[PDB]
Each structure stands twice: as C-alpha cells, then as structure tokens.
Amino acid sequence: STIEERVKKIIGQQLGVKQEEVTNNASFVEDLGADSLDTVELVMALEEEFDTEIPDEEAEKITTVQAAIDYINGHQA
C-alpha cells in the first residue's frame, strides 16, 4: 500500500474508476471529463489523508492522477 497505491485507491473512490482508467498519468477532463466531485474529492481526499486540503489552483496543475502521487510523495520527504 505504497503512496501512489493508497492514492490511486482514494482517487478510485472519489469517482469510481478502475486502474486502467485511472492510469498513473491518467487525466481528468479527458479521463473523467473532470467531475466536480473529483476536484472536490481531491480537497477532501487529501484532507482526510494528510489534512492538506488541496485548493483549486494547485488542483488544476494536479488534475491528473500521477500529480496526486508526486504531491503526496512529499509525505515521505
């Protein structure tokens, strides 16, 4: 249950996709047509994760999935 691991999972809960549909470098506006619940779930997911409450500004450049792994990775370092 590595970083990206749990991450993907959470992300998979934010909407309800699989792994092949939420590939590491998965998209949102092109993948999940960018769902409000997604951008919102990102503010809660991260909040329920490490209480980081991701904004909408940093979420834009973090729309993807892998972006939610590189930012979370910060947990380690």
CATH number at residue 4: 1.10.1200.10
Method: NMR
The answer to whether the beta carbons of residues 8 and 22 sit under 8 Å apart is yes
Question: Residue 37 has which token pair?
Answer: 């619940």
The active-site residue, picked from 35, 38, 51, 70, is 35
- Angle ∠(49,50,52) on CA atoms, nearest 5: 110
Rg, the chain, Cα only: 11
**Does 56 participate in catalysis according to the annotation?**
no
* In contact, 72 and 11? CB cutoff 8 Å: no
| φ/ψ (deg, to 5) at 50 | -130, 30
Q: How many domains does the chain have?
A: 1
CA distance 60 to 56: 6
Which range of residues forms the domain containing residue 77? Answer: 1-77
Q: What is the DSSP string of 19-76?
A: SSSS-TT--STTTS---HHHHHHHHHHHHHHHS----SHHHHTT-SSTHHHHTTGGGT
From the list 44, 35, 30, the residue with the least C-alpha distance to 68 is: 44
Q: How far, in Å, CA of 73 to CA of 17, rounded?
A: 22
Which residues fall within 8 angstroms of residue 9, CB to CB, at 6 or more apart? none
